[PDB]
Design a protein around this ligand. Structure first.
Ligand SMILES: [Mg+2]
Ligand SMILES: [Mg+2]
Ligand SMILES: [Mg+2]
Ligand SMILES: [Mg+2]
Ligand SMILES: [Mg+2]
Lengths: 182, 272, 229, 21, 48, 127
RNA sequence: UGAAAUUCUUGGAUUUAUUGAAGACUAACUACUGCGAAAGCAUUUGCCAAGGACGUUUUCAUUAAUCAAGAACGAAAGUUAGGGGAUCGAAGAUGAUCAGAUACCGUCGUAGUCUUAACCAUAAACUAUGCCGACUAGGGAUCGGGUGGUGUUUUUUUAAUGAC
RNA sequence: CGUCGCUAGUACCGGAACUAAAAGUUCCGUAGGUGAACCUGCGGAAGGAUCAUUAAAG
């Protein structure tokens, strides 16, 4: 194990969430992954380093860096902890404009369609496909297993293209039933 | 899939066919066969082709144990891949997924039927009947019209079909001219395709496009086997004498396109 | 496709056998940075051994972070390009070729509720190095400011844009390429921008985004050995 | 089958944990 | 129709086969694959 | 004692390229893609193919003499998505699993200030 | 691409790096915030004229509101004649036609997409809501101007301005 | 337990012999359409389901 450092810069809007949530962020990194943790107030970035005398898993540094990135992107902490617990979880990201060029309220309505009432549509995707979704304005992030995120993306893309939420929800119960079977 | 539920239209279609007892009718995709049984009554021999085996069996069950059973013949499989036996008349409820190839296959088949009564969607029907200067006049209308004459019998409402299709359809009659006019099919289509890239264009505008001008030049050198600017000059001339270059493709009648073809053959350039 | 069942490719029809390991014939070569930088060692490269090796070496451009060369994390977000100019005994002499920031740093600086001001200038040095500079700044809100945003009127944006432009053209013209790079590292330039633009409107995050070398003078190896000491 | 449409009290790490156990 | 008859009459005078002639169907293509070129070379070689 | 390379990773939707070169980039040290290491075109973009792709590059780099690499991840960019996919993420982890020291990680995905029209058309694509 | 084949590729494809050429277009900042009669309008700089609002103890003195007739402009698409032709792309051609969440996918691509000189004058051209004038509640944000403060910061000599 | 077949093979002069054969979304305007129960290009509309975060010159 060699001395290696990772720097993950966080945007300003995630500062306050970290400060209140950081009490639960540094423990798992320092105890389970055995990393040396700082966040630089001057650069507003999170710094992780392998301790040569203590670190044993060489992948703990990158595993921690991805975990910080997930919280940086907007995922809830417990969801971000899944990255540390697991090794086969990835973040898929894309923009609505990639699917289709929507502007003005058309763009706004598409975002509403993805979220659904009270966020109802989004959680249906999350429970059906075994993933978590962060809908940051026109930017979408999906966290989960490679197959699962692929199953999550197709549904939100369908909603972007203009498929009604009800029909999409009908597809979700079908795939959810298949998921339980396998 | 839709099914027609109006008995009057089915009876009308048979009557307009005016099948003689001597003649033999060909049916395509009879399905339920409510139209079919009437045709058997007035037809000596009926040949039926059905894509789905079960429909044919059920049709067998409708003509089951009847004197008309011996006269009726049942066939299976897509009509295209098969070679259809000779038939005097064709009246059928063809799917529109295959209407356009079907109508041409009937024309292309040697010894084609003298009259046929077929159903097409309204937009296709207008295109079949579109005449020079009409809004719906298209390349397909010019091609089919020259080979055969088509007339609109009636319009069938969507409500009559169940489940109702979103697009209405109209029964139409087509009769293939006998003898067929003596013009090569490929050459005619070659002329039509270039001139109907955009009906509202000038006929000269279609020709001056770079890509096809390569094709015409390649074709011309082949005729010599049997100077690209020279070919451009010759085309520019022959349009001027014919005067067709100024005229819109849509306005020009079938007779006008013949003046286009003959003049090109004089130059020695042949479409296809 | 990798599978044998894949339809035979045009290249696959006749295949040249791989009988030589390329790196048997390759020769390692060491790069050195100008004397303007603290850490002259910037690694090594490899080339086919001369049958020449020098021709491939010349015109080779290497990009590297400024933090490695200056040994300070303050320059982690800054990147510099160096082109090989002369070769001597496995040591590849390089000169400044260009500079730019990391994508992550740039996306950081752009934020909502504030005005992004950009200025560019095409200008030459005293050493006849024609180059293009790109400078960026952002409006900021005052300490006691209570308004959410800090947008500036288009008049100020123009009024700032002349100040950045007249400054940038001044130092470059009154400096050589080596001296110009020497200004970039402590980044004295922006501190001059901040003072000049201070009265017009408060700004933040003032940086020279990118440097391009549009043209080069006739090569002078004497001007290169002196730069390398 | 009706799919839960509200926020799952059980987190992803817990969801994958159940799949193992 | 009479003018249609005479012009049809003239067309038989100038008639030729269409096997070698490139179809107008190619107008949209604009670029040919390596396989398509080989038939054209084969066809032209057959023509001599 | 530490010779540094450049690991350029290109994570596309249908494949992932793991490319290691000298610091300049003119000289390719080893180019590997997911397609080489999988029997079906389905999993060329799969994370599994990327991991096999990454390990083979890493073993080759040790043979050459390279001991550390700087990672330049990128996506297709241009008129398409700007963020690397799971295939790129899996490859980057695999480099850590191989043992190559990672010098610096940065994303070099092409971002247009202005771009031409997309292949989708008005109604969109990616059904 | 849900799956594959047409497609390019040992004359080296894809990918890497140093460049050059062409034609479109102004990302992130970007906000139903701003301007314009509407349609519409986002790089820098210069020139040409135009305009809303504000200040005014300056000027004319009913010169005004609405508008058949009549006139200018009018998104996208569309027509004529030149230029240009990167990307995308009606039509056409062609690969595949197996599997229903991924069921319409792929390659080539004509006209067009850009521009010059004229026609065409149509949109859910929407606030599905004529124009002008008066009056009828509280609340605090934004944009432009103006007034007041013995308010903060800067001018790092003061200050005066600028920003708050 | 028998006769004649049928399938594969070997040779012989259609004919005549031999061997083997154990499985079970809704539209507007315009322009087009030759695998049209409908498709396609351009621009516009909602008469279409807003979740999370968000003072970081803090
Ligand atoms: Mg503004
Ligand atoms: Mg206004
Ligand atoms: Mg033109
Ligand atoms: Mg509007
Ligand atoms: Mg009023």
């Amino acid at each position: 194990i060699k001395f290696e450092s990772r720097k993950i810069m966080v945007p300003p809007h995630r500062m306050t969430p970290l400060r209140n949530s950081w009490t639960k962020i540094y423990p798992p990194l320092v105890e389970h992954l055995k990393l040396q943790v700082r966040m630089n107030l001057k650069t507003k970035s999170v710094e992780l380093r392998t301790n040569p005398k203590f670190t044993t898993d060489p992948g703990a540094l990158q595993k921690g860096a991805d975990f910080i990135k997930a919280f940086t992107l907007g995922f809830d902490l417990d969801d971000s902890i899944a990255l540390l617990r697991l090794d086969d979880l990835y973040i898929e990201t894309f923009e609505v404009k990639d699917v289709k060029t929507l502007t003005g309220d058309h763009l706004s309505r598409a975002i509403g369609r993805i979220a659904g009432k009270d966020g109802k549509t989004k959680f249906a995707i999350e429970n059906a496909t075994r993933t978590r979704i962060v809908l940051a304005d026109s930017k979408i992030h999906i966290l989960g297993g490679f197959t699962h995120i692929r199953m999550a993306r197709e549904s939100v893309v369908s909603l972007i293209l203009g498929s009604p939420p009800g029909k999409v929800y009908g597809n979700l119960r079908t795939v959810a039933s298949r998921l339980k079977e396998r | 899939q839709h099914i027609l539920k109006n008995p009057l239209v089915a009876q009308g279609i048979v009557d307009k066919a005016q099948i003689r007892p001597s003649d033999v009718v060909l049916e395509v995709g009879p399905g339920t066969g409510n139209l079919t049984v009437r045709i058997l009554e007035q037809a000596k021999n009926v040949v039926a082709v059905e894509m789905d085996p079960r429909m044919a069996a059920e049709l067998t069950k409708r003509v089951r144990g009847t004197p008309v059973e011996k006269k009726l013949e049942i066939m299976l499989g897509d009509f295209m891949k098969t070679e259809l036996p000779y038939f005097d008349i064709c009246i059928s409820n063809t799917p529109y997924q295959i209407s356009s190839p079907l109508v041409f296959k009937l024309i292309n088949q040697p010894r084609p039927p003298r009259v046929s009564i077929l159903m097409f969607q309204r937009e296709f029907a207008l295109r079949l009947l579109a005449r020079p200067g009409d809004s719906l006049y298209c390349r397909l209308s010019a091609n089919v019209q020259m080979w055969a004459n088509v007339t609109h019998i009636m319009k069938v409402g969507k409500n009559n079909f169940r489940p109702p299709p979103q697009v209405e359809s109209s029964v139409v009659r087509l009769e293939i001219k006998n003898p067929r006019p003596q013009v090569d099919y490929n050459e005619w289509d070659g002329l039509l395709r270039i001139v109907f890239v955009r009906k509202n264009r000038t006929i000269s505008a279609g020709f001056k496009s770079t890509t096809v001008m390569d094709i015409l030049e390649k074709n011309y050198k082949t005729f010599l086997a049997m100077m690209h600017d020279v070919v451009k000059e010759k085309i520019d001339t022959v349009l001027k004498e014919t005067d067709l270059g100024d005229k819109r493709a849509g306005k020009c009648d079938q007779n006008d396109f013949l003046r286009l073809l003959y003049a090109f053959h004089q130059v020695g350039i042949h479409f296809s | 496709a990798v599978g044998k069942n894949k339809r035979l490719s045009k290249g696959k029809k006749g295949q040249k056998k791989r009988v030589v390991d390329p790196f048997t014939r390759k020769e390692w070569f060491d790069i050195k940075a100008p004397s303007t930088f603290e850490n002259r060692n910037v690694g090594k490269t490899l080339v086919n051994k001369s049958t020449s090796a020098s021709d491939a070496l010349k015109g080779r451009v290497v990009e590297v972070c400024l933090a490695d060369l200056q040994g300070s994390e303050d320059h982690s977000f800054r990147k510099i390009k160096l082109r090989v100019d002369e070769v001597q005994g496995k040591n590849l002499l390089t000169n400044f070729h260009g500079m730019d920031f990391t994508t992550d740093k740039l996306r950081s600086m752009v934020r909502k509720w504030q005005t992004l001001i950009e200025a560019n200038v095409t200008v030459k040095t005293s050493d006849d190095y024609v180059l293009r500079i790109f400078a960026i700044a952002f409006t900021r809100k005052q300490a006691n400011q209570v308004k959410r945003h800090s947008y500036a009127q288009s008049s100020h944006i123009r009024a700032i844009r002349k100040v950045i432009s007249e400054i940038l053209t001044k130092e470059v013209q009154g400096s050589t390429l080596a001296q110009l790079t020497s200004k970039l590292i402590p980044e004295v330039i922006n501190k001059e921008i901040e003072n000049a633009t201070k009265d017009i409107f408060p700004l933040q995050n003032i940086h020279v985004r990118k440097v391009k070398l549009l043209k080069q003078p006739k090569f002078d190896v004497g001007a290169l050995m002196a730069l390398h000491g | 089958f009706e799919l839960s449409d509200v926020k799952s009290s059980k987190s992803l790490a817990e969801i994958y944990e159940d799949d193992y156990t | 129709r009479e003018e249609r008859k005479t012009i049809i009459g003239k067309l038989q005078d100038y008639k030729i086969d269409t096997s070698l002639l490139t179809s107008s169907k190619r107008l949209g293509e604009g670029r040919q694959t390596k396989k398509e070129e080989f038939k054209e070379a084969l066809s032209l070689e057959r023509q001599g | 004692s530490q010779v540094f390379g450049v690991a350029r990773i290109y994570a596309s939707f249908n494949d992932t390229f793991v490319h290691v070169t000298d610091l300049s980039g003119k000289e390719t040290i080893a180019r590997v893609t997911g397609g080489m290491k999988v029997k079906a075109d389905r999993d060329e973009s799969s994370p599994y193919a990327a991991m096999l792709a990454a390990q083979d590059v890493a073993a080759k780099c040790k043979e050459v003499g390279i001991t550390a690499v700087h990672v330049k991840i990128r996506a297709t960019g241009g008129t398409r998505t700007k963020t690397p996919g799971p295939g790129g993420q899996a490859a980057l982890r695999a480099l850590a699993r191989s043992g190559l020291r990672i010098g610096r990680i940065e994303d070099v995905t092409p971002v247009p200030s202005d771009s031409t029209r997309k292949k989708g058309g008005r109604r969109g694509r990616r059904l």
